[PDB]
Protein backbone atom coordinates (compact mmCIF):
# COMPACT_ATOMS: atom_id res chain seq x y z
CA UNK A 1 0.00 0.00 0.00
CA UNK A 2 1.67 3.18 -1.26
CA UNK A 3 -0.57 5.64 0.60
CA UNK A 4 -2.04 7.96 -2.05
CA UNK A 5 -5.61 6.82 -2.89
CA UNK A 6 -7.14 7.66 0.54
CA UNK A 7 -3.77 9.20 1.68
CA UNK A 8 -2.22 12.57 1.06
CA UNK A 9 -4.88 12.71 -1.67
CA UNK A 10 -8.11 12.40 0.29
CA UNK A 11 -10.59 11.63 -2.49
CA UNK A 12 -11.37 11.19 -6.16
CA UNK A 13 -12.61 13.69 -8.70
CA UNK A 14 -16.05 13.06 -10.17
CA UNK A 15 -15.47 15.91 -12.62
CA UNK A 16 -12.64 13.98 -14.27
CA UNK A 17 -14.53 11.64 -16.59
CA UNK A 18 -11.87 11.07 -19.25
CA UNK A 19 -9.24 9.03 -17.42
CA UNK A 20 -8.11 7.30 -14.26
CA UNK A 21 -5.40 9.71 -13.06
CA UNK A 22 -4.57 13.25 -14.03
CA UNK A 23 -4.39 16.92 -13.12
CA UNK A 24 -6.61 19.85 -12.19
CA UNK A 25 -5.11 23.22 -13.07
CA UNK A 26 -6.18 26.72 -11.86
CA UNK A 27 -4.57 29.78 -13.52
CA UNK A 28 -5.76 33.20 -14.74
CA UNK A 29 -6.79 31.65 -18.03
CA UNK A 30 -9.25 29.37 -16.24
CA UNK A 31 -9.64 26.18 -14.20
CA UNK A 32 -9.92 22.73 -15.72
CA UNK A 33 -9.35 18.99 -15.53
CA UNK A 34 -7.09 16.88 -17.76
CA UNK A 35 -6.25 13.20 -17.39
CA UNK A 36 -2.64 12.10 -17.83
CA UNK A 37 -2.66 10.12 -21.07
CA UNK A 38 0.62 8.15 -20.74
CA UNK A 39 -0.08 6.68 -17.29
CA UNK A 40 -3.74 5.98 -18.05
CA UNK A 41 -2.93 4.19 -21.31
CA UNK A 42 -0.17 2.15 -19.66
CA UNK A 43 -2.51 1.17 -16.83
CA UNK A 44 -5.29 0.22 -19.25
CA UNK A 45 -2.92 -1.94 -21.29
CA UNK A 46 -1.50 -3.68 -18.21
CA UNK A 47 -4.92 -4.34 -16.67
CA UNK A 48 -6.22 -5.65 -20.00
CA UNK A 49 -3.24 -8.01 -20.12
CA UNK A 50 -4.03 -9.11 -16.55
CA UNK A 51 -7.65 -9.90 -17.40
CA UNK A 52 -6.59 -11.75 -20.55
CA UNK A 53 -3.99 -13.70 -18.56
CA UNK A 54 -6.70 -14.78 -16.11
CA UNK A 55 -9.16 -15.71 -18.87
CA UNK A 56 -7.01 -17.38 -21.54
CA UNK A 57 -5.16 -19.51 -18.99
CA UNK A 58 -8.30 -21.53 -18.15
CA UNK A 59 -8.69 -23.58 -21.36
CA UNK A 60 -9.73 -27.24 -21.14
CA UNK A 61 -10.68 -30.00 -23.57
CA UNK A 62 -13.97 -31.76 -24.31
CA UNK A 63 -15.00 -33.81 -21.28
CA UNK A 64 -18.17 -35.64 -20.27
CA UNK A 65 -18.66 -35.40 -16.51
CA UNK A 66 -21.65 -37.65 -15.78
CA UNK A 67 -21.27 -41.43 -15.66
CA UNK A 68 -23.94 -43.92 -14.60
CA UNK A 69 -23.43 -47.10 -12.57
CA UNK A 70 -25.70 -49.92 -11.45
CA UNK A 71 -26.44 -51.01 -7.88
CA UNK A 72 -23.47 -53.42 -7.80
CA UNK A 73 -20.98 -50.59 -8.48
CA UNK A 74 -21.58 -48.33 -5.49
CA UNK A 75 -17.83 -48.18 -4.83
CA UNK A 76 -16.97 -46.99 -8.34
CA UNK A 77 -19.85 -44.50 -8.15
CA UNK A 78 -18.49 -43.17 -4.86
CA UNK A 79 -15.01 -42.95 -6.40
CA UNK A 80 -16.41 -40.90 -9.28
CA UNK A 81 -18.27 -38.67 -6.83
CA UNK A 82 -15.06 -38.18 -4.85
CA UNK A 83 -13.17 -37.22 -8.01
CA UNK A 84 -15.77 -34.65 -9.05
CA UNK A 85 -16.13 -33.19 -5.55
CA UNK A 86 -12.37 -32.86 -5.14
CA UNK A 87 -11.97 -31.13 -8.50
CA UNK A 88 -14.90 -28.83 -7.68
CA UNK A 89 -13.47 -27.86 -4.30
CA UNK A 90 -9.98 -27.30 -5.72
CA UNK A 91 -11.21 -25.10 -8.55
CA UNK A 92 -13.47 -23.07 -6.26
CA UNK A 93 -10.51 -22.48 -3.94
CA UNK A 94 -8.24 -21.49 -6.83
CA UNK A 95 -10.78 -19.06 -8.30
CA UNK A 96 -11.58 -17.36 -5.00
CA UNK A 97 -7.94 -17.01 -3.96
CA UNK A 98 -6.91 -15.76 -7.41
CA UNK A 99 -9.56 -13.04 -7.39
CA UNK A 100 -8.75 -12.08 -3.80
CA UNK A 101 -5.01 -11.66 -4.43
CA UNK A 102 -5.30 -9.95 -7.83
CA UNK A 103 -7.75 -7.40 -6.43
CA UNK A 104 -5.16 -6.31 -3.85
CA UNK A 105 -2.49 -6.21 -6.54
CA UNK A 106 -4.66 -4.03 -8.81
CA UNK A 107 -5.51 -1.58 -6.03
CA UNK A 108 -1.85 -1.32 -4.98
CA UNK A 109 -0.91 -0.78 -8.63
CA UNK A 110 -3.30 2.16 -8.89
CA UNK A 111 -1.91 3.61 -5.66
CA UNK A 112 1.60 3.24 -7.08
CA UNK A 113 0.59 5.00 -10.30
CA UNK A 114 -0.90 7.97 -8.46
CA UNK A 115 2.13 8.21 -6.16
CA UNK A 116 4.58 8.00 -9.06
CA UNK A 117 2.74 10.73 -10.96
CA UNK A 118 2.85 12.99 -7.89
CA UNK A 119 6.57 12.34 -7.36
CA UNK A 120 7.33 12.93 -11.04
CA UNK A 121 5.61 16.32 -10.96
CA UNK A 122 7.36 17.19 -7.68
CA UNK A 123 10.82 16.30 -8.99
CA UNK A 124 10.47 18.44 -12.13
CA UNK A 125 9.01 21.46 -10.36
CA UNK A 126 11.67 21.37 -7.58
CA UNK A 127 11.53 24.63 -5.55
CA UNK A 128 9.57 26.60 -8.15
CA UNK A 129 6.40 25.31 -6.47
CA UNK A 130 5.19 24.88 -2.90
CA UNK A 131 3.62 21.63 -1.69
CA UNK A 132 0.32 22.50 -0.01
CA UNK A 133 -0.36 18.99 1.26
CA UNK A 134 -3.46 17.61 -0.47
CA UNK A 135 -1.49 16.53 -3.53
CA UNK A 136 -1.41 20.13 -4.80
CA UNK A 137 1.45 22.46 -5.89
CA UNK A 138 1.14 26.26 -5.80
CA UNK A 139 3.48 28.01 -8.21
CA UNK A 140 5.80 30.81 -7.11
CA UNK A 141 5.80 32.16 -10.67
CA UNK A 142 2.84 33.00 -12.88
CA UNK A 143 2.79 30.51 -15.74
CA UNK A 144 0.23 29.97 -18.47
CA UNK A 145 -1.22 27.01 -20.37
CA UNK A 146 2.11 26.37 -22.11
CA UNK A 147 3.65 25.93 -18.65
CA UNK A 148 0.95 23.50 -17.54
CA UNK A 149 1.21 21.51 -20.77
CA UNK A 150 4.98 21.32 -20.31
CA UNK A 151 4.69 20.07 -16.74
CA UNK A 152 2.04 17.54 -17.80
CA UNK A 153 4.21 16.31 -20.69
CA UNK A 154 7.43 16.12 -18.68
CA UNK A 155 9.25 18.99 -20.40
CA UNK A 156 9.11 21.70 -17.75
CA UNK A 157 11.89 24.29 -18.02
CA UNK A 158 13.22 24.97 -14.52
CA UNK A 159 15.92 27.54 -15.48
CA UNK A 160 13.37 29.51 -17.52
CA UNK A 161 11.41 30.37 -14.37
CA UNK A 162 14.06 29.91 -11.67
CA UNK A 163 14.95 33.60 -11.39
CA UNK A 164 11.30 34.64 -11.31
CA UNK A 165 10.52 32.08 -8.61
CA UNK A 166 13.50 33.16 -6.51
CA UNK A 167 12.08 36.67 -6.09
CA UNK A 168 8.69 35.43 -4.86
CA UNK A 169 10.19 32.82 -2.52
Amino acid at each position, epitope marked *: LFGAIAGFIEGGWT*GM*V*D*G*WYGYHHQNEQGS*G*Y*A*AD*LKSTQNA*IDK*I*TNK*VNSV*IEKMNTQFTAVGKEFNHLEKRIENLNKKVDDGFLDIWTYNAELLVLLENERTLDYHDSNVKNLYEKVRNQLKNNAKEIGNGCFEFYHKCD*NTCM*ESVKNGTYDYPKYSEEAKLNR
Partner: antibody
Amino acid sequence: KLVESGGGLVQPGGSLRLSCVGSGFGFSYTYINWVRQAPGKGLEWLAAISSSGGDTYYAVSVKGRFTVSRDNSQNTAYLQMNSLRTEDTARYYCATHAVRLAVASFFVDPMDLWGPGVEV
Amino acid sequence: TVIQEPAMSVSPGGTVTLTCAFSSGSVTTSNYPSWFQQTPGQPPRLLIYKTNGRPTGVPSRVSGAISGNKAALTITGAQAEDEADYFCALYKSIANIRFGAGTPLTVLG
Protein backbone atom coordinates in the same frame (compact mmCIF):
# COMPACT_ATOMS: atom_id res chain seq x y z
CA LYS B 1 -24.54 -4.47 -34.04
CA LEU B 2 -27.14 -2.03 -32.69
CA VAL B 3 -30.86 -1.93 -33.48
CA GLU B 4 -33.17 0.89 -32.42
CA SER B 5 -36.93 1.03 -31.95
CA GLY B 6 -39.68 3.40 -30.92
CA GLY B 7 -40.14 6.73 -32.61
CA GLY B 8 -42.84 8.18 -34.85
CA LEU B 9 -45.33 11.01 -34.53
CA VAL B 10 -45.76 13.01 -31.33
CA GLN B 11 -47.63 16.11 -30.22
CA PRO B 12 -45.74 19.29 -29.22
CA GLY B 13 -45.67 18.54 -25.51
CA GLY B 14 -45.96 14.76 -25.40
CA SER B 15 -43.52 12.02 -24.46
CA LEU B 16 -41.73 9.29 -26.39
CA ARG B 17 -39.49 6.36 -25.47
CA LEU B 18 -36.69 5.01 -27.67
CA SER B 19 -34.92 1.70 -27.06
CA CYS B 20 -31.58 0.50 -28.41
CA VAL B 21 -30.54 -3.17 -28.30
CA GLY B 22 -27.07 -4.55 -28.92
CA SER B 23 -25.58 -8.00 -29.42
CA GLY B 24 -22.07 -9.41 -29.36
CA PHE B 25 -20.02 -6.64 -27.76
CA GLY B 26 -20.48 -6.79 -23.99
CA PHE B 27 -23.27 -4.25 -23.52
CA SER B 28 -22.67 -4.15 -19.77
CA TYR B 29 -19.19 -2.60 -19.97
CA THR B 30 -19.79 0.27 -22.42
CA TYR B 31 -21.00 3.85 -22.28
CA ILE B 32 -24.06 4.47 -24.45
CA ASN B 33 -24.44 7.80 -26.24
CA TRP B 34 -27.66 9.14 -27.74
CA VAL B 35 -27.18 11.58 -30.63
CA ARG B 36 -29.63 13.29 -33.00
CA GLN B 37 -29.37 14.77 -36.53
CA ALA B 38 -31.90 17.30 -37.73
CA PRO B 39 -32.72 17.15 -41.47
CA GLY B 40 -30.65 19.86 -43.12
CA LYS B 41 -28.37 20.31 -40.09
CA GLY B 42 -25.47 18.51 -38.42
CA LEU B 43 -25.14 16.00 -35.62
CA GLU B 44 -26.07 17.12 -32.10
CA TRP B 45 -24.94 15.06 -29.10
CA LEU B 46 -27.81 14.60 -26.64
CA ALA B 47 -27.01 12.26 -23.76
CA ALA B 48 -24.77 9.54 -22.38
CA ILE B 49 -25.13 6.77 -19.78
CA SER B 50 -22.43 4.84 -17.95
CA SER B 51 -21.91 1.07 -17.88
CA SER B 52 -23.89 0.64 -14.65
CA GLY B 53 -26.41 3.45 -15.19
CA GLY B 54 -25.09 5.38 -12.22
CA ASP B 55 -23.65 8.24 -14.27
CA THR B 56 -25.95 10.15 -16.64
CA TYR B 57 -24.78 13.13 -18.68
CA TYR B 58 -27.07 15.47 -20.60
CA ALA B 59 -26.65 18.40 -22.95
CA VAL B 60 -27.58 21.91 -21.85
CA SER B 61 -30.29 22.10 -24.53
CA VAL B 62 -32.09 18.92 -23.42
CA LYS B 63 -31.26 19.00 -19.71
CA GLY B 64 -34.28 18.26 -17.54
CA ARG B 65 -36.52 17.24 -20.44
CA PHE B 66 -34.80 13.96 -21.33
CA THR B 67 -34.01 10.93 -19.17
CA VAL B 68 -31.69 8.02 -19.91
CA SER B 69 -31.96 4.50 -18.47
CA ARG B 70 -30.21 1.17 -18.92
CA ASP B 71 -31.14 -2.51 -18.53
CA ASN B 72 -28.06 -4.71 -18.74
CA SER B 73 -29.96 -8.00 -18.38
CA GLN B 74 -32.01 -7.32 -21.51
CA ASN B 75 -29.18 -5.40 -23.25
CA THR B 76 -31.34 -2.32 -23.71
CA ALA B 77 -30.80 1.43 -23.43
CA TYR B 78 -33.79 3.76 -23.08
CA LEU B 79 -34.13 7.45 -23.90
CA GLN B 80 -37.33 9.16 -22.74
CA MET B 81 -38.34 12.59 -24.04
CA ASN B 82 -40.87 14.69 -22.19
CA SER B 83 -41.92 18.29 -23.16
CA LEU B 84 -41.13 17.37 -26.80
CA ARG B 85 -40.86 20.75 -28.63
CA THR B 86 -40.72 21.31 -32.43
CA GLU B 87 -36.96 21.80 -32.85
CA ASP B 88 -36.80 18.17 -31.57
CA THR B 89 -37.50 16.83 -35.11
CA ALA B 90 -34.59 14.63 -36.02
CA ARG B 91 -33.15 11.19 -36.66
CA TYR B 92 -31.91 9.61 -33.43
CA TYR B 93 -28.88 7.32 -33.07
CA CYS B 94 -27.48 5.13 -30.31
CA ALA B 95 -23.69 4.79 -30.35
CA THR B 96 -21.11 2.98 -28.25
CA HIS B 97 -17.57 1.60 -28.25
CA ALA B 98 -18.12 -2.06 -29.13
CA VAL B 99 -15.40 -4.18 -27.51
CA ARG B 100 -15.39 -7.80 -26.40
CA LEU B 101 -14.57 -7.09 -22.74
CA ALA B 102 -13.96 -3.53 -21.53
CA VAL B 103 -11.79 -3.21 -18.44
CA ALA B 104 -12.26 0.57 -18.23
CA SER B 105 -15.22 2.30 -19.89
CA PHE B 106 -14.92 6.08 -19.86
CA PHE B 107 -17.09 8.94 -21.07
CA VAL B 108 -14.62 9.77 -23.86
CA ASP B 109 -14.80 6.33 -25.48
CA PRO B 110 -15.03 6.70 -29.28
CA MET B 111 -18.38 6.19 -31.00
CA ASP B 112 -17.61 3.26 -33.31
CA LEU B 113 -20.81 1.19 -33.49
CA TRP B 114 -23.81 3.24 -34.62
CA GLY B 115 -27.38 2.05 -35.01
CA PRO B 116 -29.37 2.67 -38.18
CA GLY B 117 -31.45 5.22 -36.27
CA VAL B 118 -35.08 6.16 -35.77
CA GLU B 119 -37.17 9.18 -36.77
CA VAL B 120 -38.94 11.66 -34.52
CA THR C 1 -18.13 26.12 -29.64
CA VAL C 2 -16.63 23.94 -32.39
CA ILE C 3 -15.71 25.82 -35.57
CA GLN C 4 -15.07 24.07 -38.89
CA GLU C 5 -14.54 25.28 -42.43
CA PRO C 6 -17.74 26.20 -44.31
CA ALA C 7 -16.78 24.03 -47.30
CA MET C 8 -13.75 23.01 -49.33
CA SER C 9 -12.86 21.00 -52.43
CA VAL C 10 -9.94 18.86 -53.59
CA SER C 11 -8.79 17.48 -56.95
CA PRO C 12 -8.46 13.69 -57.37
CA GLY C 13 -5.07 12.29 -56.42
CA GLY C 14 -4.23 15.35 -54.31
CA THR C 15 -4.24 15.96 -50.58
CA VAL C 16 -6.74 17.90 -48.48
CA THR C 17 -6.62 19.17 -44.90
CA LEU C 18 -9.59 19.96 -42.67
CA THR C 19 -9.40 22.06 -39.51
CA CYS C 20 -11.31 21.86 -36.23
CA ALA C 21 -11.01 24.77 -33.81
CA PHE C 22 -12.66 26.45 -30.84
CA SER C 23 -14.52 29.74 -30.62
CA SER C 24 -12.41 30.60 -27.56
CA GLY C 25 -9.47 28.40 -26.62
CA SER C 26 -7.02 25.91 -28.08
CA VAL C 27 -7.58 22.33 -29.23
CA THR C 28 -5.15 19.93 -27.56
CA THR C 29 -4.77 16.17 -27.31
CA SER C 30 -6.71 16.36 -24.03
CA ASN C 31 -9.75 17.44 -26.04
CA TYR C 32 -9.93 14.03 -27.80
CA PRO C 33 -10.97 15.15 -31.31
CA SER C 34 -13.04 12.60 -33.22
CA TRP C 35 -13.44 12.75 -37.00
CA PHE C 36 -16.59 11.24 -38.56
CA GLN C 37 -17.69 10.80 -42.18
CA GLN C 38 -21.34 10.77 -43.24
CA THR C 39 -22.69 9.99 -46.68
CA PRO C 40 -26.29 11.17 -47.09
CA GLY C 41 -28.85 8.70 -45.79
CA GLN C 42 -26.35 6.62 -43.80
CA PRO C 43 -25.16 6.35 -40.19
CA PRO C 44 -21.92 8.27 -39.57
CA ARG C 45 -18.65 6.34 -39.71
CA LEU C 46 -15.79 7.07 -37.34
CA LEU C 47 -12.55 7.83 -39.18
CA ILE C 48 -10.25 9.13 -36.43
CA TYR C 49 -10.34 8.97 -32.63
CA LYS C 50 -7.92 10.67 -30.22
CA THR C 51 -6.16 12.44 -33.16
CA ASN C 52 -4.16 9.36 -34.15
CA GLY C 53 -6.42 6.29 -33.87
CA ARG C 54 -7.68 4.53 -36.97
CA PRO C 55 -10.34 1.83 -36.50
CA THR C 56 -9.68 -1.45 -38.27
CA GLY C 57 -11.22 -0.97 -41.70
CA VAL C 58 -10.13 2.63 -42.39
CA PRO C 59 -7.54 3.31 -45.12
CA SER C 60 -4.12 4.60 -44.12
CA ARG C 61 -4.63 7.68 -46.31
CA VAL C 62 -6.69 9.30 -43.53
CA SER C 63 -4.49 10.78 -40.82
CA GLY C 64 -4.96 13.11 -37.88
CA ALA C 65 -2.77 15.48 -35.92
CA ILE C 66 -2.74 18.76 -34.01
CA SER C 67 -1.60 21.83 -35.94
CA GLY C 68 -1.03 24.90 -33.79
CA ASN C 69 -4.26 25.40 -31.86
CA LYS C 70 -6.43 23.27 -34.17
CA ALA C 71 -7.07 19.60 -34.87
CA ALA C 72 -6.18 18.60 -38.43
CA LEU C 73 -7.50 15.78 -40.61
CA THR C 74 -5.47 14.99 -43.73
CA ILE C 75 -6.66 12.89 -46.67
CA THR C 76 -3.87 12.09 -49.14
CA GLY C 77 -4.74 10.89 -52.62
CA ALA C 78 -8.50 11.35 -52.55
CA GLN C 79 -10.76 8.96 -54.46
CA ALA C 80 -14.24 9.66 -55.80
CA GLU C 81 -15.86 7.73 -52.92
CA ASP C 82 -14.57 10.35 -50.45
CA GLU C 83 -17.38 12.84 -51.05
CA ALA C 84 -19.26 13.24 -47.77
CA ASP C 85 -19.95 15.54 -44.84
CA TYR C 86 -17.07 15.42 -42.36
CA PHE C 87 -17.86 16.08 -38.69
CA CYS C 88 -15.65 16.92 -35.72
CA ALA C 89 -16.42 16.02 -32.10
CA LEU C 90 -14.60 17.81 -29.27
CA TYR C 91 -14.68 17.19 -25.51
CA LYS C 92 -14.69 20.35 -23.41
CA SER C 93 -14.84 19.64 -19.67
CA ILE C 94 -17.07 17.85 -17.15
CA ALA C 95 -18.49 15.46 -19.76
CA ASN C 96 -19.45 17.73 -22.67
CA ILE C 97 -19.10 16.47 -26.25
CA ARG C 98 -19.86 19.00 -28.98
CA PHE C 99 -20.09 18.32 -32.71
CA GLY C 100 -19.07 20.71 -35.44
CA ALA C 101 -21.28 22.17 -38.14
CA GLY C 102 -19.79 19.80 -40.70
CA THR C 103 -17.73 20.34 -43.85
CA PRO C 104 -19.14 18.97 -47.14
CA LEU C 105 -16.17 17.80 -49.21
CA THR C 106 -16.58 17.98 -52.99
CA VAL C 107 -13.98 15.95 -54.90
CA LEU C 108 -13.53 17.67 -58.25
CA GLY C 109 -13.46 15.88 -61.59
